[PDB]
Structure formats: structure tokens, C-alpha cells
């Protein structure tokens, strides 16, 4: 009766993968997608009751991605490949927006988990976790929405795991620490599949038995309301708790309340 749900969020930012292809490195977006598909196939292999969802995080929007091989796995992989092809080929850069919409993808993942939980029969409990692989740099403009998503995930007891590839993200560290998930930075990109199978494949009950890397140094720098940048020391209002980098005689947020 143990139903495990694994929603995998893939950072599909075209600019970062294009730069990676320009670097002519051994790791590309195709290999990352293959590793994600193999991890999902393994998750479905572990038990009948396991459910899988793959969400691709893109600049324009968030896309729900999902011969000797398993029949259900074959259809799932074909659907994932078709969806990722449709997303990438029709992805036209129209605007100066470059930061990935990670917060929206996590919100959609939470909504999908909420939908799945109701459809789960009352005799079974659907344990849900969200795995995020990070490719591009962190986005500071989405601080409030990301924190709201973290709090929503914590309220429903949903694990959030981050698998950072190149550049660390403070928001992902905070999400992993608050929701109880694991934060891991991959040293060798081609070993992404092995890292996922070794670390993020087991469930939280299985994570208790297995010895896993200790949590990384999570930062808690706040975002200034008028600058939206990381700060160490800032002015915080006493009424609305809004954070400001510099002293002001009249709080901007308190202006709303007359």
C-alpha cells in the first residue's frame, strides 16, 4: 500500500545547454534527458504502485513531459522524447527573459501532487517527493514565490531534492533544508545517472537505513524588497516585516495600509 510519487523537475534552459554544447564538453542535454529517463524507469521498476511525473522547466513556460524493453517504459520514454522535442524545437527566444521559471515548475508539481493524492484510494498513503536538477543560475526575482512554494511543500510533507550540476543555488539549498530533502552538487557531469541512482533513488524510509552525504552549507541570505539582491545585513520593518537594504523614513509596503 506504499505508493511513492517521484516528480522530476528538469532545468531545460536553452541558453545554458547551448553554452554547454559550445564548450564541446562530454555532457550535453541529451545525456541529461537520458539519465532522467533511466532514473524514472528505475523508479517505476522498484514497485508497481510507484508513480512518475516529469516536468521540464523552460523560459517560456513549464512543460509536462510525462524491442526488448518494458512496454510501459517504452511508451513513457517515447512520450518524454516527443514532449521534449516539441518543447525545444518550438522554443523561440522572444524577449530578454533568460532566467528559468523554476518556481512555476515547482508550483505545477505541487498542484499535480495534490491532484494525485485525492485520486489515491483511502487504503493507501501516497508519499510524494520532488527532485530538481539545476543547470542555469539561480533567479532572485522569484524569491517570494519560491519561498511560498517551499512552505507549501513543507505543509504537505513533500520532499524537495536538488541535484545541482554547475552553479549552486541558495534557494534550492533552503528548499532542501526546510522540506528535509537532500542537496547534492555533482562533481562529474557524466556520472549524473549514477549519482541519481545512488542517492536520490531510495525513498525517505530507505534513506534512513542508507548512509548518505551530510547536508551542505545552506545559506539564508534574504532578498531586499527594493533591490531583489542577496544581502547580509538589512533594515526590516516591524509591522510588515519587509526587508530593505537602506533606512527609509516611510516604509513603502506600509503605504498600502491607510
Amino acid at each position: 500500500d506504499e505508493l511513492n510519487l517521484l516528480v522530476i523537475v528538469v532545468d531545460a534552459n536553452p541558453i545554458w545547454w547551448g553554452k554547454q554544447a559550445l564548450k564541446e564538453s562530454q555532457f550535453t542535454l541529451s545525456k541529461c534527458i537520458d539519465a532522467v529517463m533511466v532514473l524514472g524507469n528505475s523508479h517505476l521498476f522498484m514497485n508497481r504502485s510507484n508513480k512518475l511525473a516529469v516536468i521540464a522547466s523552460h523560459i517560456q513556460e513549464s512543460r509536462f513531459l510525462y524491442d526488448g524493453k518494458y512496454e510501459l517504459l517504452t511508451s513513457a520514454n517515447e512520450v518524454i522524447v516527443e514532449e521534449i522535442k516539441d518543447l525545444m524545437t518550438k522554443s523561440d527566444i522572444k524577449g530578454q527573459h533568460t532566467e528559468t521559471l523554476l518556481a512555476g515548475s515547482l508550483a505545477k508539481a505541487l498542484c499535480y501532487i495534490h491532484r494525485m493524492n485525492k485520486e489515491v484510494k483511502d487504503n493507501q498513503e501516497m508519499k510524494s517527493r520532488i527532485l530538481v536538477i539545476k543547470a542555469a543560475e539561480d533567479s532572485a526575482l522569484q524569491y517570494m514565490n519560491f519561498m511560498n512554494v517551499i512552505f507549501a511543500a513543507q505543509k504537505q510533507n513533500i520532499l524537495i531534492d536538488a541535484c545541482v550540476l554547475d552553479s549552486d543555488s541558495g534557494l534550492l539549498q533552503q528548499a532542501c533544508d526546510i522540506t528535509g530533502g537532500l542537496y547534492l552538487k555533482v562533481p562529474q557531469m557524466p556520472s549524473l545517472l549514477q549519482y541519481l541512482l545512488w542517492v536520490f533513488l531510495p525513498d525517505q524510509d530507505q534513506r534512513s537505513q542508507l548512509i548518505l552525504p551530510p547536508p551542505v552549507h545552506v545559506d539564508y541570505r534574504a532578498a531586499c524588497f527594493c533591490h531583489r539582491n542577496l544581502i547580509e545585513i538589512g533594515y526590516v520593518c516591524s509591522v510588515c516585516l519587509s526587508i530593505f537594504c537602506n533606512f527609509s523614513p516611510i516604509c513603502t509596503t506600509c503605504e498600502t495600509a491607510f
Binding site: 491532484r115 511560498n148 539564508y220 534574504a222
Partner: protein, 380 residues
């Protein structure tokens, strides 16, 4: 006339048939009506607050040995005080709690006014095994509280909570003058009695703007403390009320890097045993002092070290999500897939956001308004 002396109600007349079997449609309507039982707000009360400098005064007289509350008044009072401190610090991020114990016609400042919950809980646990003797002195406790809170900034709400078990208090001077001074100092005094109503407590609560209540049982005591947890309403804008506080990132040290520098914790330095010389923790952004617990004000430079998620957890109150426009399924000439869960829309009502004009089902609408507090479409 009387409501029940007229005609007997027939509640079963609601259901009707036209095609012999529309009861399925009626029960579908009933099931749809069962949902949306909330007002799309978890609290629905005070959406804001203010910095509170609350002082808790605990009676330490012989009356605390009474067994009205098992096992005695002191133990139940201290347990409920630990619960109150935990809940108050949970619902108030930058608040401070002070504890004063009055005994033998004198008042002892058990704990300094600060924002550390662990210190207050430890002090209460230590005070569990105190000696209950003498008579309480409301005058001395109020004098200590007023002396401490007179220099506090005006924008903070200064509050005193008094747990008065004994019905008699010894005052070295006139107490009504002290009440007038407290009223002039805008210090709110609230009293929770245990035995019966005392006139001085009622006068003090009425004049200082607080509330005076008398305990019926332990459940009523907990209810009164929980009511005292809630912050008071805050005025629109008084002055330039701000505060210099830091956000110490939890930088732990790893020996894999060459910058793994062990350091003793300032909070643990005052302990009798060996202080925790852990690899890392919370380093002060101003003077690089090391602390383990948060929120703890820095001992060296005086900077207030707070946790950003704690402050951000209340941000959804400032910007609540507007209710989506309820639209029947037939009248919506657009996509029939929910934007949040990708599920097929088969319910009679479809909710559309006012900003992005997206499609949300009933379950996703409830989840967004109750828990997410943000529209997924508006984020993009």
C-alpha cells in the same frame, strides 16, 4: 410565536426527478457543494502585527502549592507557560519575552528580555523546582517591568502579562500611582487570575487597556494563553520604525576544503561544560561571531540575527491572492485542461484567474487559495 410551533420542516423536498434517475445529478451537485467549506484564508483575523516586548510575571507565593490544577498550580502554570512561549515565538518573529517571578513581597527578574525560546524554556524548567513561600508583590513586578520597558522604542507595543494565583498582594507604596504611570507610559497590562476576581487586577487591566480573566480549568487557562499569543492590531504608519538586523547564513565547515576553521560558539561559551567547538554554524555578518541557535541577538556587536524564512513565512498576508472568477464549464470557450494539474475539466464550474486568464479546477483552486497562496500562471 415560536419557530418550532409552526410547520414541520421537510428537508427531503429538495430532491426531484424529471427523467427518473436525475438523483445522480442531484448527488453530484451535493458533492460539488460539499467542497469550498472555507473562506480561502487559514487565519482570517489579524493579517499583520508589531514588535511586542512582553513581560510574563509568575506568582511564587504559597498559593501556587494549591492542587486546583494537577499536580499543583505551579507545575501546570509552568508547563502552559512553556507552551505559550513556544507558540508566541512561532507566531511572532521579532518579539521578546521576559519572565519575572515575585516571591516574599519582592520580585526577581528570572530571565532577561530577549528572543531566545530555549533560554526561556530552560529557565522555566529550572524554576519548576522552586520554593513557593511568602506573598506576591504586584507593585515590585510592575516597577521592574516599567523600568525595563521605559527605554524601549515607542513603535514597539509594550505588554505585561501577569499570572496572579494569590488573591493578596503587598505593595510598599500606593499602586494606583503606578497604574497611572503605566498608563502614561502606554504599557499594556494583562492579568490571568487563578482563584477569583481581584479588584486591583480589574482596575489595572481596564486602565492600561489589557484584559483580566479568571481560570475555570486547565483548558480555559490554555485558551486564555492562546488568545494572548495573537499579536494586537497595528496602526497604519506611525514613524520610521525600522531595525538593523543581520541574516547569518548557516555556513558549516568541510575538511574537503582548506577553509575548514573550527570555532567555539558564543552561546555555548557560558556553559559549565565544554562548549561546542563545531566545524561551523551561524556566523555574524558584521563581526563574524559564531552562534548555533536562531533567532539570537549578537552578544558582541548587538546585531539582531534572524532567519529569513521565518520573516518570509508571513509575506502571503501582505499580498493575498484574489479569488478566481467562477465560470460554468459550458460558458468557457477555451481550453478544457487545468493549468495546474493538467487534468481534464469535467466539473460544472471552472475557475479562471483574473490576471493571466488561466484555467483551474476546483481542487487546484482550493490548493492555490489555501496553501500555495500564489497563482502558478502569474509566476510565469
Amino acid at each position: 410565536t415560536k419557530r418550532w410551533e409552526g410547520g414541520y420542516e421537510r428537508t427531503w423536498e429538495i430532491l426531484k426527478e424529471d427523467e427518473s434517475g436525475s438523483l445522480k445529478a442531484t448527488i453530484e451537485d451535493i458533492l460539488f457543494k460539499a467542497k469550498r467549506k472555507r473562506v480561502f484564508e487559514h487565519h482570517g483575523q489579524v493579517r499583520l502585527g508589531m514588535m511586542r516586548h512582553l513581560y510574563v510575571v509568575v506568582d511564587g507565593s504559597r498559593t501556587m502549592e494549591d492542587q486546583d490544577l494537577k499536580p499543583n498550580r505551579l507545575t501546570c502554570t509552568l508547563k502552559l507557560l512553556e507552551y505559550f512561549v513556544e507558540e508566541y515565538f512561532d507566531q511572532n518573529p521579532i518579539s521578546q519575552i521576559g519572565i519575572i517571578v515575585t516571591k516574599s513581597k519582592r520580585a526577581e527578574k528570572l530571565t532577561e528580555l530577549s528572543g531566545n525560546p530555549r533560554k526561556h524554556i530552560t529557565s522555566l524548567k529550572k524554576a519548576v523546582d522552586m520554593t513557593c513561600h511568602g506573598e506576591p508583590s504586584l507593585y515590585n513586578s510592575l516597577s521592574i517591568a516599567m523600568q525595563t520597558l521605559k527605554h524601549m522604542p515607542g513603535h514597539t507595543s509594550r505588554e505585561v502579562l501577569i499570572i496572579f494565583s494569590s488573591l493578596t498582594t503587598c505593595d510598599p507604596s500606593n499602586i494606583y500611582d503606578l497604574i497611572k504611570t503605566l498608563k502614561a507610559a502606554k504599557i499594556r497590562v494583562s492579568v490571568i487570575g487563578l482563584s477569583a476576581e481581584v479588584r486591583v487586577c480589574t482596575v489595572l487591566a481596564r486602565e492600561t487597556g489589557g484584559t483580566y480573566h479568571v481560570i475555570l480549568d486547565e483548558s480555559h487557562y490554555k485558551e486564555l494563553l492562546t488568545h494572548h499569543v495573537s499579536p494586537p492590531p497595528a496602526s497604519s504608519s506611525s514613524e520610521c520604525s525600522l531595525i538593523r538586523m543581520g541574516f547569518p547564513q548557516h555556513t558549516i565547515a568541510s575538511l574537503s576544503d582548506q577553509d575548514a576553521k573550527p570555532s567555539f560558539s558564543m552561546a555555548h561559551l557560558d556553559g559549565n561544560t565544554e562548549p561546542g567547538l563545531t566545524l561551523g554554524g551561524y556566523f555574524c555578518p558584521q563581526c563574524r561571531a559564531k552562534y548555533c541557535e536562531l533567532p539570537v541577538e549578537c552578544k558582541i556587536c548587538g546585531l539582531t540575527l534572524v532567519s529569513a524564512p521565518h520573516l518570509a513565512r508571513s509575506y502571503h498576508h501582505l499580498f493575498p491572492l484574489d479569488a478566481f472568477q467562477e465560470i460554468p464549464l459550458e460558458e468557457y470557450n477555451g481550453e478544457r485542461f487545468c493549468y495546474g494539474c493538467q487534468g481534464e475539466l469535467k466539473d460544472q464550474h471552472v475557475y479562471v484567474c483574473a490576471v493571466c486568464q488561466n484555467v483551474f479546477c476546483v481542487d487546484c483552486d482550493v490548493f492555490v487559495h489555501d496553501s500555495l497562496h500564489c497563482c502558478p500562471g502569474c509566476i510565469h
